[PDB]
Enzyme design. Structure first.
Site, PDB file in Angstrom:
ATOM      1  N   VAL A  39       0.926  -1.134   0.000  1.00 22.38           N
ATOM      2  CA  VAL A  39       0.000   0.000   0.000  1.00 22.38           C
ATOM      3  C   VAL A  39       0.966   1.182   0.000  1.00 22.38           C
ATOM      4  O   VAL A  39       0.593   2.342  -0.119  1.00 22.38           O
ATOM      5  CB  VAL A  39      -0.887   0.063   1.289  1.00 22.38           C
ATOM      6  CG1 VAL A  39      -0.962  -1.299   1.967  1.00 22.38           C
ATOM      7  CG2 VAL A  39      -0.339   1.088   2.261  1.00 22.38           C
ATOM      8  N   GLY A  40       2.236   0.824   0.096  1.00 25.17           N
ATOM      9  CA  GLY A  40       3.344   1.763   0.217  1.00 25.17           C
ATOM     10  C   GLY A  40       3.872   2.769  -0.762  1.00 25.17           C
ATOM     11  O   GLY A  40       3.142   3.682  -1.104  1.00 25.17           O
ATOM     12  N   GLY A  42       7.497   4.787  -3.069  1.00 25.70           N
ATOM     13  CA  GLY A  42       8.765   5.058  -3.724  1.00 25.70           C
ATOM     14  C   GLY A  42       9.194   6.535  -3.764  1.00 25.70           C
ATOM     15  O   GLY A  42       9.203   7.147  -4.830  1.00 25.70           O
ATOM     16  N   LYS A  43       9.518   7.100  -2.594  1.00 25.16           N
ATOM     17  CA  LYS A  43      10.039   8.463  -2.426  1.00 25.16           C
ATOM     18  C   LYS A  43      11.216   8.168  -1.512  1.00 25.16           C
ATOM     19  O   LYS A  43      12.352   8.019  -1.956  1.00 25.16           O
ATOM     20  CB  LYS A  43       9.066   9.394  -1.694  1.00 25.16           C
ATOM     21  CG  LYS A  43       7.928   9.924  -2.531  1.00 25.16           C
ATOM     22  CD  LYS A  43       7.106  10.975  -1.796  1.00 25.16           C
ATOM     23  CE  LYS A  43       5.904  11.388  -2.637  1.00 25.16           C
ATOM     24  NZ  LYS A  43       5.052  12.400  -1.951  1.00 25.16           N
ATOM     25  N   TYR A  44      10.919   8.056  -0.224  1.00 23.67           N
ATOM     26  CA  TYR A  44      11.921   7.704   0.771  1.00 23.67           C
ATOM     27  C   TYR A  44      11.502   6.366   1.373  1.00 23.67           C
ATOM     28  O   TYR A  44      12.155   5.860   2.284  1.00 23.67           O
ATOM     29  CB  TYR A  44      11.999   8.746   1.895  1.00 23.67           C
ATOM     30  CG  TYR A  44      12.264  10.161   1.441  1.00 23.67           C
ATOM     31  CD1 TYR A  44      11.217  10.986   1.028  1.00 23.67           C
ATOM     32  CD2 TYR A  44      13.561  10.683   1.428  1.00 23.67           C
ATOM     33  CE1 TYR A  44      11.451  12.297   0.617  1.00 23.67           C
ATOM     34  CE2 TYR A  44      13.806  11.995   1.016  1.00 23.67           C
ATOM     35  CZ  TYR A  44      12.741  12.796   0.612  1.00 23.67           C
ATOM     36  OH  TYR A  44      12.969  14.092   0.205  1.00 23.67           O
ATOM     37  N   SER A  45      10.419   5.780   0.861  1.00 19.61           N
ATOM     38  CA  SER A  45       9.942   4.526   1.443  1.00 19.61           C
ATOM     39  C   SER A  45       8.879   3.710   0.704  1.00 19.61           C
ATOM     40  O   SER A  45       8.279   4.150  -0.275  1.00 19.61           O
ATOM     41  CB  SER A  45       9.399   4.822   2.835  1.00 19.61           C
ATOM     42  OG  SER A  45       8.315   5.728   2.737  1.00 19.61           O
ATOM     43  N   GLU A  46       8.668   2.506   1.230  1.00 21.88           N
ATOM     44  CA  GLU A  46       7.675   1.552   0.757  1.00 21.88           C
ATOM     45  C   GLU A  46       6.794   1.226   1.953  1.00 21.88           C
ATOM     46  O   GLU A  46       7.298   0.863   3.012  1.00 21.88           O
ATOM     47  CB  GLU A  46       8.325   0.253   0.309  1.00 21.88           C
ATOM     48  CG  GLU A  46       8.756   0.211  -1.118  1.00 21.88           C
ATOM     49  CD  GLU A  46       9.457  -1.095  -1.445  1.00 21.88           C
ATOM     50  OE1 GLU A  46       9.690  -1.912  -0.521  1.00 21.88           O
ATOM     51  OE2 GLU A  46       9.788  -1.289  -2.627  1.00 21.88           O
ATOM     52  N   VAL A  47       5.484   1.343   1.788  1.00 22.54           N
ATOM     53  CA  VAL A  47       4.571   1.053   2.879  1.00 22.54           C
ATOM     54  C   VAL A  47       3.748  -0.196   2.543  1.00 22.54           C
ATOM     55  O   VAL A  47       3.228  -0.345   1.452  1.00 22.54           O
ATOM     56  CB  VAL A  47       3.677   2.288   3.159  1.00 22.54           C
ATOM     57  CG1 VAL A  47       2.869   2.080   4.414  1.00 22.54           C
ATOM     58  CG2 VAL A  47       4.552   3.537   3.283  1.00 22.54           C
ATOM     59  N   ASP A 150       4.267  18.312   6.976  1.00 26.33           N
ATOM     60  CA  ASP A 150       3.752  17.685   5.764  1.00 26.33           C
ATOM     61  C   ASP A 150       2.287  17.354   5.921  1.00 26.33           C
ATOM     62  O   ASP A 150       1.835  16.285   5.530  1.00 26.33           O
ATOM     63  CB  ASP A 150       4.543  16.429   5.390  1.00 26.33           C
ATOM     64  CG  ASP A 150       4.267  15.977   3.961  1.00 26.33           C
ATOM     65  OD1 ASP A 150       3.986  16.847   3.105  1.00 26.33           O
ATOM     66  OD2 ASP A 150       4.341  14.767   3.686  1.00 26.33           O
TER      67      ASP A 150
HETATM   68 BR1  LIG Z   1      -0.682   4.458   3.015  1.00 35.56          BR
HETATM   69  C1  LIG Z   1       0.567   4.954   4.401  1.00 35.56           C
HETATM   70  C2  LIG Z   1       0.319   4.622   5.793  1.00 35.56           C
HETATM   71 BR2  LIG Z   1      -1.253   3.671   6.304  1.00 35.56          BR
HETATM   72  C3  LIG Z   1       1.267   5.006   6.803  1.00 35.56           C
HETATM   73 BR3  LIG Z   1       1.023   4.603   8.655  1.00 35.56          BR
HETATM   74  C4  LIG Z   1       2.415   5.715   6.390  1.00 35.56           C
HETATM   75  N1  LIG Z   1       3.485   6.225   7.099  1.00 35.56           N
HETATM   76  N2  LIG Z   1       4.336   6.842   6.146  1.00 35.56           N
HETATM   77  N3  LIG Z   1       3.876   6.736   4.997  1.00 35.56           N
HETATM   78  C5  LIG Z   1       2.653   6.039   5.069  1.00 35.56           C
HETATM   79  C6  LIG Z   1       1.764   5.670   4.047  1.00 35.56           C
HETATM   80 BR4  LIG Z   1       2.177   6.143   2.258  1.00 35.56          BR
END
Ligand SMILES: Brc1c(Br)c(Br)c2[nH]nnc2c1Br
Length: 327
Positions: A39-40, A42-47, A150
């Site tokens: 559900v994540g 591709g910037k600074y992370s994968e969720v 943010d």
């Molecule tokens: Br979708 C989601 C959810 Br749920 C959470 Br908790 C996050 N924390 N940083 N980025 C997030 C994203 Br994208």
């Protein structure tokens, strides 16, 4: 410029509280968490959506990709300092791998409705209720000497079914220090405060209140990005076309700032367009005198003039949300 509120909170607290670079994280066990579906990002992370293999509970797993050291510690320390606060996403654990592939943050599970589909269904009272819940999160993080930086619909996760609100993604958050010069490349374009658009670097918690104000205007007027710029320069122009240029000039003069001649011409000269002009039969049921007054007190050029989150909570617009909260 210095924060009108909570300006000296970090000074009073020990060095360890705000000195995130000197953080030695206590790693948990990666085995205790299985990754199910992305559900994540591709910037600074994968969720991802995962589960805790020790109790079978769902959770959110955030894997930090090419985002080296400072930032990771920074986000972890801010999350630990805020864990338990009103409507602050809860960091459950922090794991990684013994050998190489690095960082992963574990959070309590959160269940969203693509804000784009939810906002149209929100009633007059729902908006009052959710902004008020978000206000609790900002006053808490701010009172803890932390700026979110943010604030936007995507980071204000709302589980309408359970009327639950969580302010997520503290990857851009920072500790506030009087007179400190911060990076202005924070927030998302449509929610950037004037301070960031004219390079006023010694900003504060009030930045989050401008972002909140943009979200609010967007919700009550049914105009998603309320301030829809194409780039950072055009973002300021769009703001000026509503708030007026006279107020922009006062703000620049007060903090001794002079715009780039090409940007100044680009902004030009504009009269203040009264808030009532964005009202129509489509959003009518969401607009009221108090909603316009509240919004007016948030979207001010001068960050020092904006309502703090605490003061925001006592505005008449929330009187009903406030009363219900009594017993
Ligand atoms: Br979708 C989601 C959810 Br749920 C959470 Br908790 C996050 N924390 N940083 N980025 C997030 C994203 Br994208």
């Amino acid at each position: 410029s210095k924060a009108r509120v909570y300006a000296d909170v970090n000074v009073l607290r020990p060095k360890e509280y705000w000195d995130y670079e000197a953080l030695t994280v206590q790693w948990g066990e990666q085995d205790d968490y299985e990754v199910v579906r992305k559900v994540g990002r591709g910037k600074y992370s994968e969720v991802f959506e995962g589960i805790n293999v020790n109790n079978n509970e769902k959770c959110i797993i955030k894997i930090l990709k090419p985002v080296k050291k400072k930032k990771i510690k920074r986000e972890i320390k801010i999350l630990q300092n805020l864990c338990g606060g009103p409507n602050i996403v809860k960091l459950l654990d922090i794991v990684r791998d013994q050998h190489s592939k690095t960082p992963s943050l574990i959070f309590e599970y959160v269940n969203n409705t693509d804000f784009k589909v939810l906002y149209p269904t929100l009633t007059d009272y729902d908006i009052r209720y959710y902004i008020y819940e978000l206000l609790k999160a900002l006053d808490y993080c701010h009172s803890q000497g932390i700026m979110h930086r943010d604030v936007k619909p995507h980071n204000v996760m709302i589980d309408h079914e359970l009327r639950k609100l969580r302010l997520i993604d503290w990857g851009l958050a920072e500790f506030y220090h009087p007179g400190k010069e911060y990076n202005v490349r924070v927030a998302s374009r449509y929610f950037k405060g004037p301070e960031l658009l004219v390079d006023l670097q010694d900003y504060d918690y009030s930045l989050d209140m401008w972002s909140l104000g943009c979200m609010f205007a967007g919700m009550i007027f049914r105009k998603e990005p309320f301030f829809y710029g194409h780039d950072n320069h055009d973002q300021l122009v769009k703001i000026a076309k509503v708030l007026g240029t006279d107020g922009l000039n006062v703000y620049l003069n007060k903090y001794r700032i002079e715009l780039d001649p090409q940007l100044e011409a680009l902004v030009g000269r504009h009269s203040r367009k009264p808030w009532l002009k964005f009202m129509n039969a489509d959003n009518q049921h969401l607009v009221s005198p108090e909603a316009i007054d509240f919004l007016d007190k948030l979207l001010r050029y001068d960050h020092q003039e904006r309502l703090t989150a605490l003061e925001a909570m006592t505005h008449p617009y929330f009187q009903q949300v406030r009363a219900a909260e009594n017993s």
